[PDB]
Amino acid sequence: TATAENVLQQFKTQIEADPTIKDKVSVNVTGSNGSATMIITKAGDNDFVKVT
Amino acid sequence: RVHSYRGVLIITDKLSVEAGSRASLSGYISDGGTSDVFTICRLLD
Known part of the structure; x- marks a missing residue:
C-alpha cells in the first residue's frame, strides 16, 4: 500500500524473501517510471504457476 | 512497448570415468628348489 517501477520492485523483493514459493518461481522487473513491467514464470521442479 | 529481460x-x-584392469602370473614346473645346505649324502637303514 503506497512511479510504477518503485511499486513493482516491492513485490519482487517480497516474493524473493518469502520462505516458500521463491525456490519454485522466477520473477523479473524492467522498464522505467511509467513503462515498468514484471515477468513471472515456472522455476525449479515446480511445474505450475498462476497469477491473479 | 518493447521489453527485454535476462536469464542465467x-x-x-555427461562426465563419466572408467579404469580398466590387468592380471599377470608366472611360474614353472619345479625341480630341486633351493637349499642353503647342499652336500653328498649317504642314507643307511
Whole structure:
C-alpha cells in the first residue's frame, strides 16, 4: 500500500524473501517510471504457476 | 512497448570415468628348489 517501477520492485523483493514459493518461481522487473513491467514464470521442479 | 529481460546461462554435461584392469602370473614346473645346505649324502637303514 503506497512511479510504477518503485511499486513493482516491492513485490519482487517480497516474493524473493518469502520462505516458500521463491525456490519454485522466477520473477523479473524492467522498464522505467511509467513503462515498468514484471515477468513471472515456472522455476525449479515446480511445474505450475498462476497469477491473479 | 518493447521489453527485454535476462536469464542465467545454463549448461549440461555427461562426465563419466572408467579404469580398466590387468592380471599377470608366472611360474614353472619345479625341480630341486633351493637349499642353503647342499652336500653328498649317504642314507643307511
